[PDB]
Amino acid sequence: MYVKLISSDGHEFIVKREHALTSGTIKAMLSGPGQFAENETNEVNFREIPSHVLSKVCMYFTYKVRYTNSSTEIPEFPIAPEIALELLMAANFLDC
Amino acid sequence: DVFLMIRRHKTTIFTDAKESSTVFELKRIVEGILKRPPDEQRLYKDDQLLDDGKTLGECGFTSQTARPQAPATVGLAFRADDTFEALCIEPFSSPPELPDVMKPQ
Amino acid sequence: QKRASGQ
Amino acid sequence: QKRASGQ
Amino acid sequence: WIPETLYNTAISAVVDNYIRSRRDIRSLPENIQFDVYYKLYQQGRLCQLGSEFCELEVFAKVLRALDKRHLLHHCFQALMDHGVKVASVLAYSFSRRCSYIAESDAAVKEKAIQVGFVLGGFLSDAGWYSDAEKVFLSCLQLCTLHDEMLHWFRAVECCVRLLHVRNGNCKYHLGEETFKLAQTYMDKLSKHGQQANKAALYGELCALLFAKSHYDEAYKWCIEAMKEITAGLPVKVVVDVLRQASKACVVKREFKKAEQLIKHAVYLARDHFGSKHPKYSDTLLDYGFYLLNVDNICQSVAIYQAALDIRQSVFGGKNIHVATAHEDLAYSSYVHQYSSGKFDNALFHAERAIGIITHILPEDHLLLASSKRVKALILEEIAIDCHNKETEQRLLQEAHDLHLSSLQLAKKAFGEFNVQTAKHYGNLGRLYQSMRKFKEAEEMHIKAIQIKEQLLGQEDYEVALSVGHLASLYNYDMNQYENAEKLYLRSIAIGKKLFGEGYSGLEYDYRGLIKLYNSIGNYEKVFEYHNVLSNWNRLRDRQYSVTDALEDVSTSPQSTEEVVQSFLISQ
Amino acid sequence: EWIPETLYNTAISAVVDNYIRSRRDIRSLPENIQFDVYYKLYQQGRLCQLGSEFCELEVFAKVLRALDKRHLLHHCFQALMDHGVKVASVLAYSFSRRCSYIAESDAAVKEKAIQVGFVLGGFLSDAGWYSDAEKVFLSCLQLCTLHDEMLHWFRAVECCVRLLHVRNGNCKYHLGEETFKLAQTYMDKLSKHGQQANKAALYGELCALLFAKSHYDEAYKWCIEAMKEITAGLPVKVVVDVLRQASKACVVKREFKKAEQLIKHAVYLARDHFGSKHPKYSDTLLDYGFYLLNVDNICQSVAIYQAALDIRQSVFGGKNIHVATAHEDLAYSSYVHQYSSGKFDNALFHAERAIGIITHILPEDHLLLASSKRVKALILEEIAIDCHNKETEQRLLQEAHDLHLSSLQLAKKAFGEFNVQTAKHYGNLGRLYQSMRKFKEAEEMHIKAIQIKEQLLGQEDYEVALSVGHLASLYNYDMNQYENAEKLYLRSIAIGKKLFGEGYSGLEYDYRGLIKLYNSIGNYEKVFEYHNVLSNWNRLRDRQYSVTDALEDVSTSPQSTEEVVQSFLISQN
């Protein structure tokens, strides 16, 4: 129930599988030949996504999954101005 | 409910623990992730051993400073064979430093 | 009216 | 006039 | 509450950092750049968006997102309401690019024409025909500088669109020249043994000749256009040809074929495009034209309001496509709510039509004549239905100057002997009838009748309507019942031949003859026309049980080849 | 004389004409230079080039530091909002977004953000964008409620003082009491550490809140508290605000002798420190006109509002809520002044301008319409009566009925069924139904107004007096009830002569109706003595037509601060 979102640098962002299927592209990568359970966690390679943005992506996964169907007013996801453009292209590619 | 980033060398475990849960459960949750016993690992909140007895709320992991938007990191070492190693937590990357338009140039 | 509608 | 100014 | 997507949060973060990443957005994928610019529109930053959309390099990449084009049409228009002249700036930029690359190979010219075609299609779909005509003129010059097969095809496809932007811009004198250029290029194409389909061009020429009120030639080119519809044409081409064919059939008094043509056009538009598309709104507008001209006015208001609500959604305020929807809905609400006297919604729409056309088009433009005419018709009926003689004079004088301006525009553009200037003559005659100036009213109605019977045969609907108006002038005002009776009989005969006994325009002739004979005698004639009017009222009440016209269109009634084949078999 | 232009202004024009190729380098200019380039951009009509640089928060922060040329910045900002770009909401959202990121940052960055938020929220509240200044002040409060330190309580109570001003003006009265309670909690937290913040501004804002909800009994107590809290070290703006709110609370409890001193001192202070062309001076002028209109000095009140509006049309621009409030205040004053003359040409023009602005900048379900609309719904009524036509009369009365129903619905939704504003709307509806010849409905509406207003205000209050005057006019002229009209006319006359003396203007509208009553019922001795009374009233009315302009009636240094305040405080015993 854990997946290892390896970034381009080599950082192995081990996030829960329920969180990773928030993004459509990761759900597609974990389907087909990519669902082969190598080790216990499925190593997803992201050779085009750096670590400083994949960390924000995983934080968004654990934020949306926790804050889904929230009764209280939901706080906005904090995206720094220097990361915003690179996290924009990572949000489109990952379809999250 | 507290959210953490258990980074050791380059891995970054994105886990969620109860505020009242102790550090021993935080070490035991890595058993299902990296499959190494909690005896041979110790955590690190910015050069601070996190012993099994004390709870997460005692060692500063309040839910205000470790919210899901920006979870609080915690180090880790796996004792190698018998002696623990230093925190080799590598920084993620340097995002492209956008120039300040108000900077005189 | 006295006449039809306009055209 | 009959009545005062409108309040 | 639900968490907003990382895509939208990142767009909000990129837009907020806009000054620091203004040029870095232009390196984004084309599906992210438009979302960022739409966020600029949503946030209210219309100035930054207008600065970006005024550059052809940025706007070309925005035009490549065809999914959210309905979102672009409401952004661009907002910019044109913001005061920034984005359409003319983009047309000028494209003309400058074409003038710069005139000395190059045939590889980059083909790239610029394809960018030119999408830009011109956007500028003519948004209603900026005077600004799309420059883009298409530049594209035509590029296709003219060389004479190969593909450039001949592109020149024909560009003169098809140049004819369209010179029809909606009321440049009917250049439309013949554009069609001649297209015909020359098509003849040169067929000389080499490669034939280009002529459905779209002949449909545009049908719209041209109908707008000039050349209904015989309009129907001839209607038949010629429907003779060139295949199964491989784009749905837009088939829809346009169906619309103009239905309009030509309506003005040729052939409602039996116009009904199937326009209902199939509406079905095709609602199927392929959707219920909130500008082309579907155009089909609804022509369908409302059909319904208004077949004595089915009550449904037409339900169609024009449907057509307008689509055009106010995709485009927004201060657009000629919304202005045409307003000036058509205002006339249909005027006709529907004529005997009721409730010209409150009708005038509100006619006020917006002039209020939009005056802003976006010059004072000497023909499209302002039709919007002035409708508001002058509404103001006249508000004048005679009120009690203040000061109002009865002020509104009548306003309608008088509006009618004179419309008549001057129509006379300058078309001529002295056209149908659309005879309609203004008839409206001026009605106005003079209301305004207690009868010597000029008789002259105006005589001119309108003479022009509309010299042109539109002897037993047309328009000449019958003007004959009825002159007969009401003779009957109720001049007391020359000998001529008024003859004109009433002519109008009744033509209305019965065209619309049958259930014609709603026969009441103003039956009551006219009743008053005519009450004035002179023959109470047997009074009784016979009274029971004829009673039978007419009974038949109208029987026929009044109508349904919604969109449901009358239904879903998948016919097929594309079936309707065209039936029309051609029925000549 | 043709003096050549300064090299500064000549190079400014050369920089603007070369704006596109030197846009980035302009942001790296001194604040005084950088503002002048943008003001030249506005002057040249290049709003889109100017508006694309005022949308950024940091670029707009430097032009906000030019405190000297703030009257030009307000005019540029109002031009931008009329242009179409929503810079007020864009700047507020940009501040909130860039503010939520540095919540955990150091004290220097948070201090800089708090200062930027104060200047931006003060600008947006001065410009009238209360819905947009609230978000800036909410974000400032969110910064302040992070570290429970010493200065953070002071900055948070300042934030909550500024939130009342942007919530009273935005008609968010339900959140106003909550904001005041939060501010009072933070003042208690300060008092637990042996430090007392100055509570004059907060109590003045609460007085504005309670006057807005028509809680004059509580508003007077809280303005007394605010005036007790005024010290010598207060800023001029704060003491001016407290003084004018205390005047508005004193004039509505009909303490005219104290209200005149408070508002004349407020006008004097506003004209000294701020000048004759300042937004705060215009606010004091509006409150002075409110005083003058409430004390039967209507002819001077019209000129005071005309002076108040002309400042707001110069400092601000077109579609602004401050210009709209000046219009709707001047429209009502011109209405009441020209009620007898019947020349409702300027009053209708000003009431139409107010609705034409509020509808454009505020939602249709907003409370600030309920004022403007009803003002028009008064004038449209009096034009309907003056018009000899029946069709135009019917149309105008129907339009006024729709406007009065809308205003009454807004007041009922905002305050409730038992508010004084709802009573005013019921009285206006009663007058209208009297004009609409619906006499039963007019009687029911006037009875409802009396029942609502009698318990809320005093038994012999001025508003009750004018409303029983309206009901007596209905009973006398229309319903031919000749005893209830008599007793209500006597009540109105007694209250008018008790409050304003023999110079009250409603006395003639009561005496003429009562003379008509007695001519309908007899007792010609009463008719003769009331003709004598009316002649005496006319004599005193023409004697009191001095109408000296109230702008110079405040004089130059008649008294000083903590002397008018001290006199008002000692007079309370």
Ligand SMILES: [Zn+2]
């Ligand atoms: Zn602009």
